[PDB]
Design a protein around this nucleic acid. Sequence first.
RNA 1: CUGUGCG
Length: 1432
Amino acid sequence: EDDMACVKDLVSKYLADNERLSRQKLAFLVQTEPRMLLMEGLKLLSLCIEIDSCNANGCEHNSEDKSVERILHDHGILTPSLCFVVPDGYKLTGNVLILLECFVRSSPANFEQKYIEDFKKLEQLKEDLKSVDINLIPLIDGRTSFYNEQIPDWVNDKLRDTLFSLLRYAQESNSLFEESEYSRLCESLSMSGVESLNVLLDNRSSHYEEIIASCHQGINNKLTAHEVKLQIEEEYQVFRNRLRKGEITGQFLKVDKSRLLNDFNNLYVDEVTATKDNIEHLIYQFKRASPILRFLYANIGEKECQMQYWRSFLNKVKSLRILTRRKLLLIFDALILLASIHDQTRHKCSKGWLGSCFISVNDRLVSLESTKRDLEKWVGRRQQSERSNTIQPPDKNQILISMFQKTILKATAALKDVGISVEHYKINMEVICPDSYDLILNFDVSGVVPTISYQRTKFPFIMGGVELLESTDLERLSSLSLALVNSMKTSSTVQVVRCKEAYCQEFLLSGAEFQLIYQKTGECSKCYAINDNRVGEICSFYADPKRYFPAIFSAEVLQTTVSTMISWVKDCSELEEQLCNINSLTKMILVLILAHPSKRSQKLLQNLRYFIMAYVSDYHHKDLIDKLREELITDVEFLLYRLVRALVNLILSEDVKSMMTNRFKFILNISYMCHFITKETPDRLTDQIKCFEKFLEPKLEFGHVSINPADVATEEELDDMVYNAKKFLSKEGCTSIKGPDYKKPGVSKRFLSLLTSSFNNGSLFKESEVTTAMLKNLCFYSQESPQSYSSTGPDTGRLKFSLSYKEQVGGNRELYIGDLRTKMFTRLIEDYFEALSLQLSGSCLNNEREFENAILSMKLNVSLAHVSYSMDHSKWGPMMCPFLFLATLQNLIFQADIKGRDYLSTLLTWHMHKMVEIPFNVVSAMMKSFIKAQLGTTQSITEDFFYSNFQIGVVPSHVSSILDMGQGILHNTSDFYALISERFINYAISCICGGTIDAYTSSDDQISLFDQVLTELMQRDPEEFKTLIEFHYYMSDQLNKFVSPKSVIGRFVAEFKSRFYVWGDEVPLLTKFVAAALHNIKCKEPHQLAETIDTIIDQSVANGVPVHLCNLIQKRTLSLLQYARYPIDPFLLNCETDVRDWVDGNRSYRIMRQIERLIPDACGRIRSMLRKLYNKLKTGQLHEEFTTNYLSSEHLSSLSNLCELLGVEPPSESDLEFSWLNLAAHHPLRMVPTIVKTIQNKLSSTFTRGAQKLLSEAINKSAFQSSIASGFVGLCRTLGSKCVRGPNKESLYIKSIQSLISDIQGIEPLIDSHGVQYWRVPLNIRDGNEGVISYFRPLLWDYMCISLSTAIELGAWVLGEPKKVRVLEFFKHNPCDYFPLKPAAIKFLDLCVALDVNCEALSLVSHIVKKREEHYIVLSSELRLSHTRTHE
RNA sequence: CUGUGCG
Ligand SMILES: [Mg+2]
Ligand SMILES: [Zn+2]
């Protein structure tokens, strides 16, 4: 009892003297009996955490446990009926209510579940209380430990230990609590997953035994190699007999180039009433196909004014809310109208007008007549109201002048408050003349009437004239795309559709002003009209604005992409005369898919890849052509198909035989142009419906769909599950009257037996292998932890997976999102099967070395022109089964491993009984359609299922079935099954023929490489080889592996994981990489965007994209940044790089090269000093007296000291003045040491600290997703907002800082040819007016730090003189001439991180772990035109 | 309450 007295003394001594805690302390002190003492101690601890949480976040403790309605009625607010919710904390302030329910959870799954439950409850309460008109912002305080402010750490730990011992003693003495509650509290108080199932009671009933018996019955896994070989031989003989007699149909055909071309040409012969289109006629039709295309190729041909200045000024001041958002709008319209009148009287201007309407603030088109009527009404109203009191002359003109002056004065006062003066907006106050009201009312304009043609019932210009060879069309599309994307930024305010007020985006083309007019705001598809002041209503269309990002500034990039592709097939003799047309066709295709980004066009372009793969092959699936045809609707889609057909027929002509690799590369890049179209969904609901029908139809064909199963599985449902498990294994083949039924899900007992026996006897291996309410009142009593488990799952319920889609190029992929507990449960299976496949070889899914081995093997196979068989597998997800994996694992033969296999079987059976939740949107759409059909002819299978369930009451919510694996959930298990099944299939093929096959598989993809024997059998025995291929297909089918119709047999090209290899030439997916860099723009800090673009372009250069195109892409990214008017500092992107900058160097080296380019002889002296310094630190000295004596002192003074220490010529006074503007000098930009911040953020992220922060910031962003165009407009909006944080936490605009810089005349800007800005800041002015000089950083110091970091990371060669390349003389410029290149790969870590904390310019040491490219393929000419950097 | 920016 000594410990009891010690604990009582400790709690009496070290408890805070809170009056709330005094009652509980008095209750605790009086306690004698261990049971009530335990209970009171638990209450005291719970009260401690509750009070600490309430006070920490500023809330009042709810000791009375009053409901929300009771508190509201007590505090004077009436509320309607509310759900029973008791908030732990509550506080009212003004119109803001805070609820602060707090909980403590030691487990991660329990923590996540409780946080989500509390968040849902608070959302429900907020939705209910919204009618009360009281704001309620949820606040959840989850803690992973008991530590808090009331009790110190060691006292809290000792109290917890003694109280837990007390509860153990009470349980073993009187057993007051149940076993369930006792175990729950012990697990919640004691503070890997494989042994986590040991603490759960096993309630596996006879259902699990019956499932195991089903997966064991009829399966023989003890067969010897001889018996397996005999069975395989007999199976093959029967297959040969039945394939020869025709009882089994073949699934492959020999590749016929003419027949393939004819099938492609007649892919859509029902509305395309031709097969050979004239290319000139195609150009004529393309330049007039659609209103956008008509505008792109038509003859639209023809000093800032005061209107623009005033419009920008009033657009800025309208955000400050000087203020009733109706009167300031009228004043702003009048001011802009006065500015326009001033411009027209001074120099006869016409910009900003669209006939009788003018462009006011907030992008609004405002009618002149309505403006002047409103102005006269307002002026007269205030005249008749004001003069009712006194006797003075109103003088309407002077009234308007006074209102203008007051509004302008208030706007100026608000604008200077952030630090912006009106003269930087260049507005002239002489536009407000004494003659103002009469001038604005006696103003008349007559012109065109802007309209929007919402229907499609002629074109104002000549529809032809712009040549395809030029870049005019791409520039026009760029401007139109920018206008379309900017149309989404307009704030929400309030047939010939000639309107009085609309919204407009202005863009200039060929010296003429054009307006994009729309009548609806938001990020949604709407009707747009292109209008002009000369002729109104140029055209009208129905574009979706958020699908027009990739072409915004990409005219040069796309033109150079087309030029490179054309230069590939340029020396072909047969294509010499038909070389212009190809170019035109290529150009046309690109323009089309940029003008009309359609999912159907994306699919049509994607299928060309499989067509061209089959064209250069030897055998292809007979159903390939049917799979290449998907429905086309619009005229532009059919035009695209016709253009693609013409290009293919030109390139893949029978008369053309010279350079087949180049033409294959060209056609593959044409196909991969589909990546230019955005992968984002056009219609979310339609994609959800398609995802659900793809998920449901195979389960209906199999016949097992369990509608709304309970958490406790019904006996009939269990019987049906066992029946379908047996049915999955009852697949016959080649030994029945009917024969095999292809593509039907399931496996054969015979072939499962053969595969398991082959695994068991080693035939598949190689030589290298062989009271209760009070507990609920606690803030730490866990309630969601499972305590037992049945065959169907834990007692907390079967596994839930919500179904969604992940959007890709060419459709979507099903996605199953589960609870965190379910994710941990699945991770056990995934880790086990990942390790099991890691023991074997050939799986290229998770291994990177195995993928390199596969690449080398494919290169060798193609070099020797052996047979390569590239396979995809159709419906790998839906057709595969967790029960199949269970049956495979139960028969494989490899103490505690029996227990491990039992746990794996239990988890797999849990995955068998998973419930997939139907999306709510799908159910709502089905209910609406059903109501409209029954109250008010297709009736799809899913529609029929929904209708049948609807007519009988119960609405489907969850679906359970045998025939489904989570797409990506049981992914490693599927990879292991594919590995072993393909090893068996190759073994059987070797047992049949004389050759052998080496296979590499990644979980749905495979490349099979045939040795010489099988290739020779192909040439000298086509029938035997074809029968072998059909037998491989049949064997795969017997093992639930369905070869895709897109798989190809051939010696020309080998493909695996979207990588293509041919002999001699390389196959870069240039269009894919170009589109990837054009669709990579986010709303992050601009340097992070620059780093992402640099990484993508590094990958592109590695994969073969020429360096000039990559430089153009970098220029495009900087153009995007410049549109947001973010200053281009020298640390964003280098747009003059060469091959050596990407191969030998890194991002830091590229920044060094950019800085050296900016300032020529100012980096030479620094480099001499750096060479001396690097030599001294390499000899072993000076290491400790430089990192803390120079990197800790001030800048611009340590450089001279370092130079005089090393005996080198110090930098001149001119050199030390070079600086760059760092807008993140004091704090990072508001986009809503650095290495120390990263370390803190990574340490406080796993579970112990910051877990709740990560979960909250992830759930906030979970129900918030946007497009790339939305990200770009958000970036522009943020960079135009108050994103720059000052030294004293103040918020400033970028324009504020730039105006402050302009205030000082000593500082001068200097801009590179590419827009990179660096400043010369004289040293005489750097300490007086420190308001803005603190944002500047010396350039030489940053260069020195980055150069030391790069020298340490890469070597001393970076410190040599950068001598340029000499004449060369003359080498042939063959575009398809590739060269392989490899980059040259503790004491210095401290110095590198010391450099990182001192150079706030680039992330130097954090870039190592965020994978470095290990292989480069460049162009020989570009490599030989690179610079030289040699250490001397 | 947050953009007015066509390299
Ligand atoms: Mg493949
Ligand atoms: Zn003008």
